[PDB]
Amino acid sequence: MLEQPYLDLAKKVLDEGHFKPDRTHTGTYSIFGHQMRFDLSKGFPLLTTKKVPFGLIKSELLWFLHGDTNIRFLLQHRNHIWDEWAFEKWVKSDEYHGPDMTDFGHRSQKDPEFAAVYHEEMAKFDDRVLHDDAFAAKYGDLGLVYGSQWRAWHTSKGDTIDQLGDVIEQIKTHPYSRRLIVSAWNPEDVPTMALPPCHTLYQFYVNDGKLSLQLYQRSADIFLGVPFNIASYALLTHLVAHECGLEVGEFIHTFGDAHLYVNHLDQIKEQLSRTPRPAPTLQLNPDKHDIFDFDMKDIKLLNYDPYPAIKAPVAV
Amino acid sequence: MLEQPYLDLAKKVLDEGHFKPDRTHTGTYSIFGHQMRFDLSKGFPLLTTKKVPFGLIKSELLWFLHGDTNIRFLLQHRNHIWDEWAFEKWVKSDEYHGPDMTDFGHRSQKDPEFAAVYHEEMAKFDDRVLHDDAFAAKYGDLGLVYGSQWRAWHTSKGDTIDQLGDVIEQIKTHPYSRRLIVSAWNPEDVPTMALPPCHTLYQFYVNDGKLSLQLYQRSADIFLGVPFNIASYALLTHLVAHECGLEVGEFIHTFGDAHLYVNHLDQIKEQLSRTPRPAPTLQLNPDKHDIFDFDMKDIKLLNYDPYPAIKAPVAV
């Protein structure tokens, strides 16, 4: 099926990957350099061998597409993928007066009752970003996130470039353009960035009326990360195809360091016992066309019949 | 042999590639997304199925490594790969008083005697950059070329980042770093660039004492371009390995648009009749270590026994 390339990557890393130490101190099995393609006319690459929350992937994509960098939009759609970053900044500032929470990500995963004090602490934070319009502007805005990188690349002359926006006008006026690249890797910010872009750069390609996209991802958490990533970009490939009035081609995922954290081997092994189900289909609101003014409801996924989800510890 | 991946890419494009129009108006056969690896411990990937001028590749690499952006260093080592760019700027300025040479690249390939007036014109230019220290600073400096992109990434705060230099200190202090990327794609300069980077970005990787490098190349001229490119980066992988005191791993070449210009089909077809010869070996000056202060003589290639070169028209 469509998602067999994923299952293959995982197998590969299981028996070929070599042990490798890392930033988080959870070890990993790793390979360097890997690529896979998904013919997007065959169906949507949302994994069936495990239940992946599509809702989180699209609320985050639309957050990106809007050029939004404030955690608030996410919280409103009950999406907490980035809270950990906003909270972080907050706990290390003056306004914060409370149970310190230093190196919390670890401690939550390591202590029972701390985890409980931490989430109540976070509970207030999310609610406070959700309600205090000033607090939100102050602690809700991450600044350098894909949205701003994609749509507001700050220049040296103090202005801003709508990188993606320009690229799309280019696909229209020059579909055969070999230079259709959008980049999220800013060399001058990367050294002081808590998390320099994982999805470093991507390129569009047009031929025979079909649009294709290749993504260069420097680091991949094969079990926890890759499944979400695949969906974000295939979705993105469908949106851009929609706007440009082109048919959908393939999504080529290129990898730098594709790894498996040692604390995930039993799970990936289990998922590999499962047979792929037929793939879901993507359905976009035909009446609307400007993808930049797209919202939750203009994107429907039909026929997603996945195996149950698989819990897994996080790496830190 | 080592270079079989190249021969495969070419075959692939021959029967799988689809016709595609382009910038230069010479048509092409193209594929999107392709990757190949070269185990650098097996030998140096300088093609044997065709004689490729290694001298040009290293004088250009050392020009890059020095952070030099002046055509002058090249001319001195009788390397003319970039003259066409300097000349271009010159002919379209005040100081130039002479036989206009508009759209020359084409005309040379299209008219007999114009080609002769053009090269004498260029002859003077190269000599004038080679001798008039002021002319050279004025017309010899291209500005935005890999050297400056690699070593003097201009920031918004007016300063400069030694991108590659930092990355190398990083390989030393944190070889397991997943974030070891050097980038040449500046979003704010790309729109007014005569030729936005073809070699967009590359990443290093360390494990088991071996250093590997993956290159993301957005556009590839399979016949004329790819053979030079492969050598530049494998060489670069050997130099960095030298400095960091690491063994050499693999060179993974990832491609965006890998194409064959229609005006090259008879040649690639001919090269495909040839059987690969054993690969040459690379030999670096052990006494010297700082690759930034490396020059022509500290890099020797032994046992290069290639088939004769293959003339081919250029695309415009």
Ligand SMILES: O=c1ccn([C@H]2C[C@H](O)[C@@H](COP(=O)(O)O)O2)c(=O)[nH]1
């Ligand atoms: O969309 C994403 C974001 C992150 N990661 C993972 C990759 C690594 O497991 C970790 C980042 O590690 P570094 O490369 O920064 O060291 O997060 C993904 O796989 N996909």
Ligand SMILES: O=c1ccn([C@H]2C[C@H](O)[C@@H](COP(=O)(O)O)O2)c(=O)[nH]1
């Ligand atoms: O190192 C290089 C430099 C250039 N090219 C080729 C690729 C294309 O044939 C042309 C650039 O075309 P655009 O992508 O800019 O359209 O030059 C290479 O293959 N390798």
